[PDB]
Amino acid sequence: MDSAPFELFFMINTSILLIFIFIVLLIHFEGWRI
Amino acid sequence: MDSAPFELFFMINTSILLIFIFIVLLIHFEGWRI
Amino acid sequence: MDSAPFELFFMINTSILLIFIFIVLLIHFEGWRI
């Protein structure tokens, strides 16, 4: 009945996750299908 | 000889992952692959 | 002056991420670059 601490964890994570997830996807399509 | 606690870990993990993996992928293709 | 608990966090996190990131790249090269 409390998502105070869990929120931050999911927040900070989303950053590093989105960064790698997006970064990888970008390159993969930026010309990584040699 | 007990995978009670280990099960949940693998459950919540695969879930959160599959969510972002699919969700992020959907958007990236829905018009976010700039 | 203690990175005991912080280490695991960075470990489990990097792991799950590296897994999805690598896994994707693997397949793409395993025969998904049609």
Which structural technique was applied?
NMR
Angle at which helix B4-31 crosses helix A4-31, to 10 degrees, equals 50
Question: What are C18's two structure tokens?
Answer: 């590296």
What is residue B4's DSSP assignment?
A: H
Of C29, C30, C14, the closest CA to residue A28 belongs to C29
Domain range list for chain C: 1-34
Q: How far is CA B1 from the centre of its chain?
A: 27
Query: Which of C9, C15, C16 is the best mutation test for B, with the most CBs of B within 10 A?
Result: C16
Asked if residues C7 and A7 have their Cβ atoms less than 8 Å apart, the reply is no
Q: Please, what sign has the CA dihedral across residues C28, C29, C33, C34?
A: negative
Q: How many CB atoms lie within 10 A of CB C20?
A: 19
Report helix, strand or coil for B7.
helix
**Residues 6+ away with beta carbon under 8 Å from B17:** C16, C19, C20
| Chain B residues within 8 A of A26 when measuring between CB atoms | 33
First to last CA, chain C: 51
Report the greatest alpha carbon distance in chain A: 50
- Side-chain-side CA neighbours of residue A8 (13 Å): 3
Q: Name which of A17, A28, A33 is nearest C17 (Cβ-Cβ).
A: A17
